[PDB]
Amino acid sequence: LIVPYNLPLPGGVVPRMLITILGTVKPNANRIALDFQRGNDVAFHFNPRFNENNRRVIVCNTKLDNNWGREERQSVFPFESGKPFKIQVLVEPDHFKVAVNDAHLLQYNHRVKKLNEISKLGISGDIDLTSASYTMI
Ligand SMILES: OC[C@H]1O[C@@H](S[C@@H]2O[C@H](CO)[C@H](O)[C@H](n3cc(-c4cccc(F)c4)nn3)[C@H]2O)[C@H](O)[C@@H](n2cc(-c3cccc(F)c3)nn2)[C@H]1O
Ligand SMILES: [Cl-]
């Protein structure tokens, strides 16, 4: 699975939909990014950064009209350089549920209301990708 990787989401994102991304973080990693896309806009951007002011942080944002909105930041960082990870993204009708390494990490309230229109997920950054699928729960 070649990074940058695109995972098509036919029908779009829909409540009860569970996205599982398995992979490994590369050594001396700087950044990782998941991008739930609605055209040229990014509905949900999940962005672990490993060195921002000598600190590790997860930045979440929405890009509407080539402009990034309000940053949602999480200090809780479950990723490590040269270590495998499991990211699980559950779609609910009120928020995105993000779990990493089988423990809930963050919630991301839907800025884009047209969930049937979010038809693509992009996996990019400093990672070796093992598995990318989705199913209903
Ligand atoms: O919003 C998310 C976007 O962020 C900008 S960096 C952004 O730059 C702005 C410049 O005006 C501000 O500085 C903003 N900022 C910093 C703080 C702060 C700083 C410290 C502490 C603290 F409290 C607060 N508050 N606001 C920065 O986060 C990235 O380029 C962008 N992006 C990344 C990628 C990308 C491409 C390929 C791979 C990949 F992983 C990511 N492709 N687009 C995306 O991640
Ligand atoms: Cl970045």
User: Is the CB of residue 125 below 6 angstroms from any atom belonging to ligand 1?
Assistant: yes
For residue 96, give its domain range: 1-137
Other CB atoms closer than 10 Å to residue 95's CB: what's the count? 13
| Mutation test residue for ligand 1: of 71, 79, 121, the one with most atoms within 8 Å of CB | 71
CA pair distance 98, 19, nearest whole angstrom:
10
CA of 47 to the centre of ligand 2 (A): 7
Q: Is 72 annotated as a binding-site member?
A: yes
Contact yes or no for 32/25 (Cβ under 8 A): yes
**Dihedral, CA of residue 63, residue 67, residue 72 and residue 75, to nearest 10:** 100
Exposed e or buried b for every residue in 8-36, given b needs 16+ CB within 10 A?
Answer: ebeebbeeebebebebebbeebeebbbbb
Q: What is the separation, in whole angstroms, between the first and last Cα of the chain? A: 25
Q: Which residues pair with 84 in a beta bridge?
A: 24
Other CB atoms closer than 10 Å to residue 55's CB: what's the count? 10
CA pair distance 45, 41, nearest whole angstrom:
10
CA pair distance 72, 111, nearest whole angstrom:
12
Q: Which residues pair with 55 in a beta bridge?
A: none
Q: Is 69 annotated as a binding-site member?
A: yes
User: Is the CB of residue 62 below 6 angstroms from any atom belonging to ligand 1?
Assistant: no
Q: Which residues pair with 67 in a beta bridge?
A: 64
Give the residue from 89, 124, 125 showing the smallest Cα distance to 110. Answer: 89
Resolution of the structure in the document, Å: 2.0
Tokens of 35: 């991008």
| Mutation test residue for ligand 1: of 21, 36, 47, 55, the one with most atoms within 8 Å of CB | 47
- Secondary structure (DSSP) of the chain: -PSSEEEE-TT---TTEEEEEEEEEPTT--BEEEEEEETTEEEEEEEEES-SSS--EEEEEEEETTEE---EEE------TTEEEEEEEEE-SSEEEEEETTEEEEEEE-S---GGG--EEEEEESEEEEEEEEEE-
Q: Is 52 annotated as a binding-site member?
A: no
User: Is the CB of residue 52 below 6 angstroms from any atom belonging to ligand 1?
Assistant: yes
User: Is the CB of residue 128 below 6 angstroms from any atom belonging to ligand 1?
Assistant: no
Experimental determination technique: X-ray
- Structural domains in the chain (count): 1
Tokens of 16: 């009860």
Say which residue the tokens 């509905």 belong to. 43
Please give the radius of gyration of the chain, using alpha carbons only, rounded to the nearest integer.
14
List Cβ neighbours of 69 (8 Å cut-off, separation of 6 or more).
Answer: 61, 62, 63, 111
